[PDB]
Amino acid sequence: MTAYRCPVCDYTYDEGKGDPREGFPAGTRWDQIPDDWCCPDCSVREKVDFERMGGK
Numbered sequence: 767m768t769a770y771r772c773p774v775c776d777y778t779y780d781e782g783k784g785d786p787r788e789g790f791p792a793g794t795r796w797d798q799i800p801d802d803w804c805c806p807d808c809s810v811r812e813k814v815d816f817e818r819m820g821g822k
Contacts, residue, residue, distance in 0.1 A: 768796050
């Protein structure tokens with residue numbers, strides 16, 4: 767599964783995390799989020815700055 771966690775730009779929410787509060791309920795793929803999203807931190811930090819995890 768995909769996991770993008772980077773608080774340096776914006777809150778972190780994994781695909782299977784289930785965070786419908788951010789307009790992304792269960793099932794909502796990370797690709798669903800618009801690349802043109804507006805954030806306070808990310809405003810200056812690129813979105814690609816994120817770092818995919820890799821645990822067991």
